């Protein structure tokens, strides 16, 4: 055994390196001219950042 009260120095994060997040305070839904992207018979929805 290794009894020493050793500190964990090496640690990893596979996620995003950010500490601030943008949130909605007052929701809303508005009409739009374009509703989605289409490819042949497929159709993908619009995802905003």
């Amino acid at each position: 055994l290794l009894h020493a009260d050793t500190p964990r120095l090496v640690t990893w994060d596979a996620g995003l390196c950010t500490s601030f997040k943008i949130v909605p305070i007052v929701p809303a839904q508005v009409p739009q001219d374009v509703l989605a992207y289409t490819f042949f018979t497929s159709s993908y929805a619009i995802q905003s950042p």
Partner: protein, 49 residues
């Protein structure tokens, strides 16, 4: 076929990034290589092993 490290653009925040940047450095400076361990442990032994 995987790279040992990589630089990528992606959502994140300069502050957090900058911090982990220094944390990186600090650790890296603490590096040792087995050959050094050989010398250390051997010298401690006062020459019996």
């Amino acid at each position: 076929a995987m790279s040992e490290w990589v630089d990528v653009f992606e959502t994140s925040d300069a502050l957090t990034v900058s911090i982990r940047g220094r944390w990186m450095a600090r650790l890296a400076r603490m590096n040792i290589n087995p050959t050094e361990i050989e010398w250390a442990l051997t010298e401690c032994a006062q020459g019996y092993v």
